Design a protein around this nucleic acid. Structure first.
Lengths: 129, 88, 85, 173, 70, 66, 225, 156
RNA sequence: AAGGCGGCCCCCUGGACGAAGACUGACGCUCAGGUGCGAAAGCGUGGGGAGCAAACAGGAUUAGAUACCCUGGUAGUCCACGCCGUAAACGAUGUCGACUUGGAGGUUGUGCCCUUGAGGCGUGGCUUCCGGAGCUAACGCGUUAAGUCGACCGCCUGGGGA
């Protein structure tokens, strides 16, 4: 069964990147949407577009620079089997700061750097590089 | 399998709308009737293992349904189990 | 259905036919014309030499020729035509 | 633009699948291979033997136009089935023409029956017909001067499998 | 393979016809097959193996054919 | 080149003996679907029909038997 | 420069059968008429133009172009194209490692040249009949193989190709070297090795000729410039 | 200007009707002390010839590596066949902390400061390849910025 | 579901798939212990016994031949009801879900289309082969993954001893 939606989304994104797909569609969720937004902000995707009322479909638009994909790596860290929560001092640095770590904090989902700035840690969703 | 007419009858009785058919209670009833029917068969045909598998599956499904009912709404479940005469 | 119920028209022993060959399968020639049937004229007749013949050398590809039935099985649809006649 | 889309459905409209539209211009001749271009993906490797008429020598130089056939696409590289069958359809049309006035008239000359019907040959092609068709009555063309000139009056055709027996001599009938 | 010699038919021809009939029947082949017991497994194996061989003959060889020998 | 697809028959009939006779051998055997070119779905049905016929002595099991 | 109508007339828009296609050519394909793939002329033409421009540019800096086409239908034509713009060509089978292994092939070329000289300029004659025959044969062989590239000297600065799938060895070599490739690429072919892909019918003769001619013209123009 | 290190030389055999024909494989690696690295694997009946061949191979098909000063830009994994390799950028003074074939490649590349472990297989040829791969994949900050549509200060 | 299942007919009976709708409203996935089903041989009691055939006997072969080959031949194979609980019980590949280029088939539905014809254009299920990216020690796998991921369980830690 479908157990981890965020993870699934990530996987889809990765596959799109691999296969040179322009845009990647999936069933929308609030968390997922937030993640997408974060990605956009950090510049790993071009744009995201949710569409529908009853069962809405999030559509990300993937980015390609000089032939190859932008999202070089994208891993879940927290996962239903084994959750990862970090305190603001223990927050990671993906690719020695060049990549980002999506972290869900009390003040919404944000990149690791942002979280650090705020002065708060939380559940580490995914590393993106 | 359960005859169409019988099924319809079952639906009408247990189902609130009678067009509903998918009500948990209705489903349970349907399962139960089928099980009852198959008992007779299996008394006769003790080595019919393949068929018995299906029966077992049905029973399991029924149990699951009952469980679901219990957590959701207790009174209804109780009523159902009075009607059908399910020990649990 | 359609060629095989009343397969008694070109039957009786040796009714000559004009049929275009289709593909020569190194044992055969496959001349087959008469409304959705299959004939062979395999390698043994074809000429007046038996075994060294190689049907691609001796007749053609896609050509209407001298052939007649010599044999019909209406059951295991193998009408076995000939060409040495 | 939709110039190209419209051009595509236009070019669909101005071709068909069988050998119907006489379109391939003979753009190289070499013995023993003719080759055309009927607005297909590739050029046909035509035999020379689909194009010599009734005595053995070629009839069509560069620019000449015969349709071929279709419905079979790509055996590796190339395009067609032969135009000579094309010709068969034309023959069928002339045979069909009979129906209109209940009499197709050409020349039919039938010397003998391979399988019970004199053989009749029309233009390049020669066809076989059931035994009755050759003669109107019991006249028999064995006493007639060999390979005689009449026409063909049709006696019998098998309509699925192509066997046509036609009526030599007896113009009056 | 029941056969009757036609009126004014040669012997040799008749014999040939009979032979043909027999071949069609696959009687000899059948007999050969039933001479000894083939384990089910063996039977299966032969059938699958044969099929595989056939497939190989059909496709791989066709591919080879595309390219000229000399 | 199946007959039953073109005719568009719902079920093959064991009573229709003539039809069956086209699909049976001179030796009585049922003819392969390679040779007849019968569709697979129909072929099975045909076979069944033949079998039924054989039970009813409408078709023979074999040429030799008596 | 080359119009769409002309291309259509030629038979560029036609491709291969649908079962023989490459899914990397799905962008350049328009549709499938009668179970045969149709190349999108709207996407082809601009690309072609670009390629032509590139070629012209190359010519302008005194670039050496190599024309490859070993189909045997358009062997005559490619040679002609090459000669019109006095450029080099490989109209018969591409020798494996012609460019990558130039230094060995340069010896072969030299040998060929020597043979030619012996044949023509010497005017000695008086040679043992079998030996002479052998020599002649050798010359013929060389001419067939390396006739177009005998005056190339070094490696070419660009590589024009009539079929990518057929001349993949050449393409690969080019890639290895880092020579720009200008391939005509039908639906069955692979465009990944090719730098300046040209979606078009490799097989049809008229189309091939058309492809050649424009290229030749552009080269000439470049030279003039 | 180019520095070239023969990593390993190994004797390899081919059995024939007579007996064993021996030969020698030379694995070399060359670099300019900056980004450019290239390994070469040469083979010959005698050692020196083989080595020469390897060197020649190396000299062509080089590869560029983005180096932030003396060290790497971020921790990078590289795998090839059995040999899977981890290498991590390190502070000036620490030196090349790495083992065997891996060390050599690093040295030529002009990394001065690394912490590098070779997990899995340590078959020189494979491990050098792995190292090369790791180096190659490693992107710089500028490059990343370019990719993402940002400035360098946005990424930090 | 696996083990497996093959003349024809009837009775009882389980599952699968498609077509549209209508309903229920997360009721789901996985599963240590537990429970069941589980080829062949084998066991128990009672039947049956044509063919085949462990054991056994004779004849060959051979240096020997407690084998291969031949002639016989009993348990067994067959049925009923119990037990046994294992097999290279194999795809040597746990189950469930999602995502990622293609081609050639087979089988079984189903929508439209002049079925003008065996067809034309789709859309579902199961399935055989080839092959791309990717993966792999390689062999190979490759939308039925051995690819990219998630959930749960089972299992491995040098060879022998075992």
């Amino acid at each position: 069964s479908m157990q981890d939606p965020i993870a699934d989304m990530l996987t889809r994104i990765r596959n799109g990147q691999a296969a040179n797909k322009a845009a990647v569609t999936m069933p929308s969720s609030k968390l997922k949407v937030a993640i997408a937004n974060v990605l956009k902000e950090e510049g790993f995707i071009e744009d995201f577009k949710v569409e529908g009322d009853t069962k809405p479909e999030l559509e990300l638009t993937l980015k390609y620079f000089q032939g190859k994909a932008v999202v070089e790596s994208i891993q879940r860290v927290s996962r239903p089997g084994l959750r990862i929560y970090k305190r603001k001092d223990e927050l990671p640095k993906v690719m020695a700061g060049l990549g980002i770590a999506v972290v869900s904090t009390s003040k919404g989902v944000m990149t690791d750097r942002a979280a650090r700035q705020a002065g708060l840690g939380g559940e580490i969703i995914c590393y993106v590089a | 399998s359960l005859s169409t007419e019988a099924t319809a009858k079952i639906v009408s009785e247990f189902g609130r709308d009678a067009n509903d058919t998918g009500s948990t209670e209705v489903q349970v009833a349907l399962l139960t009737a089928q099980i009852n029917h198959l008992q007779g068969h299996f008394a006769e045909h003790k080595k019919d293992h393949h068929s018995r598998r299906g029966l077992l599956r049905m029973v399991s499904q029924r149990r699951k349904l009952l469980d679901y009912l219990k957590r959701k709404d207790v009174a209804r479940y109780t009523q159902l189990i009075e009607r059908l005469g399910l020990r649990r | 259905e359609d060629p095989w119920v009343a397969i008694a028209k070109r039957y009786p022993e040796g009714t000559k036919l004009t049929g275009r060959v289709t593909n020569l399968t190194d044992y055969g020639c496959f001349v087959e014309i008469e409304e959705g049937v299959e004939g062979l004229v395999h390698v043994s007749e074809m000429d007046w030499t038996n075994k060294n013949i190689h049907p691609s050398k001796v007749v053609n590809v896609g050509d209407v020729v001298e052939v007649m039935v010599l044999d019909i099985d209406e059951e295991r649809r193998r009408i076995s035509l000939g060409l040495k006649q | 633009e939709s110039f190209a889309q419209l051009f595509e459905e236009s070019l669909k409209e101005i071709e068909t699948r069988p050998g119907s539209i006489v379109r391939g211009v003979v753009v190289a001749i070499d013995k023993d291979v003719v080759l055309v271009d009927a607005g297909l993906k590739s050029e046909s490797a035509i035999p020379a033997e689909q194009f010599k008429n009734a005595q053995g020598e070629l009839e069509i130089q560069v620019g000449d136009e015969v349709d071929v056939a279709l419905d079979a696409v790509e055996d590796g590289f190339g395009e067609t089935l032969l135009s000579r069958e094309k010709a068969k359809r034309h023959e069928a049309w002339i045979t069909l023409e009979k129906a209109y006035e209940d009499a197709e008239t050409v020349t039919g000359v039938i010397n003998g029956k391979v399988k019970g019907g004199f053989t009749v040959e029309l233009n390049g092609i020669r066809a076989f017909l059931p035994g009755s068709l050759v003669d109107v009555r019991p006249v028999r063309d064995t006493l007639h001067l060999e390979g005689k000139e009449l026409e063909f009056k049709v006696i019998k055709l098998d309509q699925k499998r192509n066997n046509v027996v036609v009526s030599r001599r007896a113009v009056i009938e | 393979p029941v056969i009757k010699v036609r009126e004014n038919e040669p012997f040799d021809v008749a014999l040939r016809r009979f032979k043909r009939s027999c071949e069609k029947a696959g009687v000899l082949a059948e007999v050969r097959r039933r001479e000894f017991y083939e384990k089910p497994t063996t039977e299966r194996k032969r059938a699958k193996a044969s099929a595989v061989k056939r497939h190989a003959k059909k496709l791989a060889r066709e591919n080879a054919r595309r390219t000229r020998l000399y | 080149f199946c007959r039953f697809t073109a005719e568009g028959v719902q079920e093959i009939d064991y009573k229709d003996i003539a039809t069956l006779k086209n699909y049976i051998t001179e030796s009585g055997k049922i003819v392969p679907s390679r040779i007849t070119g019968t569709r697979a779905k129909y072929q099975r049905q045909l076979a069944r029909a033949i079998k039924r016929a054989r039970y009813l002595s409408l078709l023979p099991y074999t040429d030799r038997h008596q | 420069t080359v119009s769409m109508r002309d291309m259509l007339k030629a038979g560029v828009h036609f491709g291969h059968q649908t079962r023989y296609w490459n899914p990397k050519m799905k962008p350049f394909i328009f549709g499938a008429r009668n179970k045969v793939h149709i190349i999108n002329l709207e996407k082809t033409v601009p690309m072609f133009n670009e390629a032509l421009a590139e070629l012209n540019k190359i010519a302008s800096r005194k670039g050496k172009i190599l024309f490859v086409g070993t189909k045997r239908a358009a062997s005559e034509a490619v040679k002609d194209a090459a000669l019109s713009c006095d450029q080099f060509f490989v109209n018969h089978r591409w020798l494996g490692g012609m460019l990558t292994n130039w230094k060995t092939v340069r010896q072969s070329i030299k040998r060929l040249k020597d043979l030619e000289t012996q044949s023509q300029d010497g005017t000695f004659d008086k040679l043992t009949k079998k030996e002479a025959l052998m020599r002649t044969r050798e010359l013929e062989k060389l001419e067939n193989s390396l006739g177009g590239i005998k005056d190339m000297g070094g490696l070419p600065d660009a590589l024009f190709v009539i079929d990518a799938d057929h001349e993949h060895i050449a393409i690969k070599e080019a890639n290895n070297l880092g020579i720009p490739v200008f391939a005509i690429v039908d639906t069955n072919s692979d465009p990944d090795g090719v730098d300046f892909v040209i979606p078009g019918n490799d097989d049809a003769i008229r189309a091939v000729t058309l492809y050649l001619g424009a290229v030749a013209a552009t080269v000439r123009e470049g030279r003039s410039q | 200007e180019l520095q070239e290190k023969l990593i390993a030389v190994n004797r390899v055999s081919k059995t024939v009707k007579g007996g064993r024909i021996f030969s020698f494989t030379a694995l070399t690696v060359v670099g300019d002390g900056n980004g450019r690295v290239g390994f070469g694997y040469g083979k010959a009946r005698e050692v020196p010839a083989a080595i020469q061949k390897a060197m020649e191979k190396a000299r062509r098909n080089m590869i560029n590596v983005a180096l932030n000063n003396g060290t790497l830009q971020h921790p990078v994994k590289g795998v090839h066949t059995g040999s899977r390799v981890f290498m991590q950028p390190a502070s000036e003074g620490t030196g090349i902390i790495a083992g065997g074939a891996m060390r050599a490649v690093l040295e030529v590349a002009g990394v001065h400061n690394v912490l590098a472990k070779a997990y899995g297989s340590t078959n020189p040829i494979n491990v050098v390849r792995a190292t090369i791969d790791g180096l190659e994949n490693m992107n710089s900050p500028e490059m990343v910025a370019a990719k993402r549509g940002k400035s360098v200060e946005e990424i930090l």
